[PDB]
Amino acid sequence: GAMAPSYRVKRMDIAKNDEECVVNAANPRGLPGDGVCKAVYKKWPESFKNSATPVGTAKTVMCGTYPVIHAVGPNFSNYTESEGDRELAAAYREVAKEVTRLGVNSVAIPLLSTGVYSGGKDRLTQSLNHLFTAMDSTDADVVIYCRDKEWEKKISEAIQMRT
Ligand SMILES: [Cl-]
Numbered sequence: 151g152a153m154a155p156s157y158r159v160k161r162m163d164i165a166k167n168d169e170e171c172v173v174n175a176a177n178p179r180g181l182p183g184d185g186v187c188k189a190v191y192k193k194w195p196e197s198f199k200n201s202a203t204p205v206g207t208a209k210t211v212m213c214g215t216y217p218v219i220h221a222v223g224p225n226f227s228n229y230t231e232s233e234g235d236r237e238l239a240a241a242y243r244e245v246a247k248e249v250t251r252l253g254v255n256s257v258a259i260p261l262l263s264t265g266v267y268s269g270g271k272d273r274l275t276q277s278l279n280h281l282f283t284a285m286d287s288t289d290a291d292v293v294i295y296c297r298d299k300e301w302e303k304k305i306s307e308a309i310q311m312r313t
């Protein structure tokens with residue numbers, strides 16, 4: 151575990167993280183995809199061997215000794231708000247189980263279902279609150295990755311509001 155488990159946020163490419171493992175915002179089919187998923191495919195292509203897994207689950211594949219946790223958030227274009235919310239919570243619970251099993255002291259994590267799977271809605275608070283629900287009982291240092299300056303400020307405020 152980390153000596154004093156923390157949350158932090160950084161505004162940069164999650165493919166250049168400084169943590170002991172990465173969470174991919176994966177598609178169910180293990181395809182290279184776009185956005186975070188395509189950056190993760192370029193950096194760790196070996197981790198897409200048999201990475202296909204259903205919505206609401208996470209599947210870890212090792213790139214050398216570096217774990218890639220493929221977490222499949224729901225596409226809100228296809229899911230109802232209710233079922234989508236349940237699957238988004240479940241994906242993060244499966245991430246916490248994998249981070250625990252791996253025994254890592256740190257993990258790089260994107261906000262699931264906030265990009266092309268958002269169904270055109272702002273889901274920063276929804277996704278971050280499910281991330282906290284899952285990861286609060288873990289002792290890894292969590293580093294959240296985002297690309298927007300306003301999102302960075304809002305995620306940082308949410309972290310500091312609890313401290
Ligand atoms: Cl960057």
Ligand SMILES: [Cl-]
Nearest residue numbers: 264265266267
């Ligand atoms: Cl997304």
Ligand SMILES: [Cl-]
Nearest residue numbers: 296297298301
């Ligand atoms: Cl972002």
